[PDB]
Amino acid sequence: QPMEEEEVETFAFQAEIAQLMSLIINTFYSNKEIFLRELISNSSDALDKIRYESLTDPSKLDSGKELHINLIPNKQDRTLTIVDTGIGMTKADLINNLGTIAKSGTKAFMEALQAGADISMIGQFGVGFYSAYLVAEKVTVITKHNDDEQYAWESSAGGSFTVRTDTGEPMGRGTKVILHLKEDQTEYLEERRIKEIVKKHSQFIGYPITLFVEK
Ligand SMILES: CSc1nc(N)nc(-c2ccccc2Cl)n1
């Protein structure tokens, strides 16, 4: 094929977010399983946003009426994908919300964690997404909002992330978080383990979850 050209935007994480990511990555924490509760909570919040906004404007569901979460472990590529049909993010929302803008709870959470707080407290500080780095060496976030095109965000930490127009499979609306798991964290690809953690932490979320198991 003749050479194709793709635009990439590389961003630096806000200094404190980068400090938090390094703390989560480079330090042992027990109870890493809470990463799933945090991502399912973000999906649930996104599904509430489109649900309430569609009450006033039902055409916001032209990109899909079904409001749900799918969990997709892939043992071949060692990824766990969390997909929702929530509100999604515009490119601007994605750049702002996933690393460039200082988050209110970052400083406070780092002090709490170092003082011996369990990693489980992360969600209360509004930085729960970053718990993905307890189990993943790389995270890819694919998102589609009614007001913009589909975008792919990705980071292996190291203080930067990239954003590009997604060349992958289009989604009607919502967000897909792809966790590229660390070699020692493959238990999160096991259906019994995923079911255990969803029953323990994610029972009252408001939307149906479906776990897709590879035969
Ligand atoms: C606003 S739509 C949305 N959907 C999901 N699943 N997650 C998020 C989110 C919120 C904060 C930080 C990172 C993400 Cl990916 N945002």
UniProtKB/Swiss-Prot annotation:
Keywords of this entry: Acetylation, ATP-binding, Cell membrane, Chaperone, Cytoplasm, Host-virus interaction, Hydrolase, Membrane, Mitochondrion, Nucleotide-binding, Nucleus, Phosphoprotein, S-nitrosylation, Stress response, Ubl conjugation
GO molecular function: ATP binding; ATP hydrolysis activity; ATP-dependent protein folding chaperone; CTP binding; dATP binding; disordered domain specific binding; DNA polymerase binding; enzyme-substrate adaptor activity
Post-translational modification as stated in the protein's UniProt record: ISGylated. S-nitrosylated; negatively regulates the ATPase activity and the activation of eNOS by HSP90AA1.
GO biological process, one term: positive regulation of protein catabolic process
Location of this chain's protein in the cell: Nucleus; Cytoplasm; Melanosome; Cell membrane
Modified residues (N6-acetyllysine): K49, K75
Binding-site residues, ATP: N42, D84, K103, F129
Transcription in keyword set: no
Spans annotated as Interaction with NR3C1: 1-215
GO (cellular component) term, any one: ficolin-1-rich granule lumen
Coiled coil spans: none
Record text on subunit structure and interactions: Homodimer. Identified in NR3C1/GCR steroid receptor-chaperone complexes formed at least by NR3C1, HSP90AA1 and a variety of proteins containing TPR repeats such as FKBP4, FKBP5, PPID, PPP5C or STIP1. Forms a complex containing HSP90AA1, TSC1 and TSC2; TSC1 is required to recruit TCS2 to the complex. The closed form interacts (via the middle domain and TPR repeat-binding motif) with co-chaperone TSC1 (via C-terminus). Interacts with TOM34. Interacts with TERT; the interaction, together with PTGES3, is required for correct assembly and stabilization of the TERT holoenzyme complex.
Comment on protein domains: The TPR repeat-binding motif mediates interaction with TPR repeat-containing proteins like the co-chaperone STUB1.
Family statement: Belongs to the heat shock protein 90 family.
Biological role stated in the UniProt entry: Molecular chaperone that promotes the maturation, structural maintenance and proper regulation of specific target proteins involved for instance in cell cycle control and signal transduction. Undergoes a functional cycle that is linked to its ATPase activity which is essential for its chaperone activity. This cycle probably induces conformational changes in the client proteins, thereby causing their activation. Interacts dynamically with various co-chaperones that modulate its substrate recognition, ATPase cycle and chaperone function.
UniProt protein name: Heat shock protein HSP 90-alpha
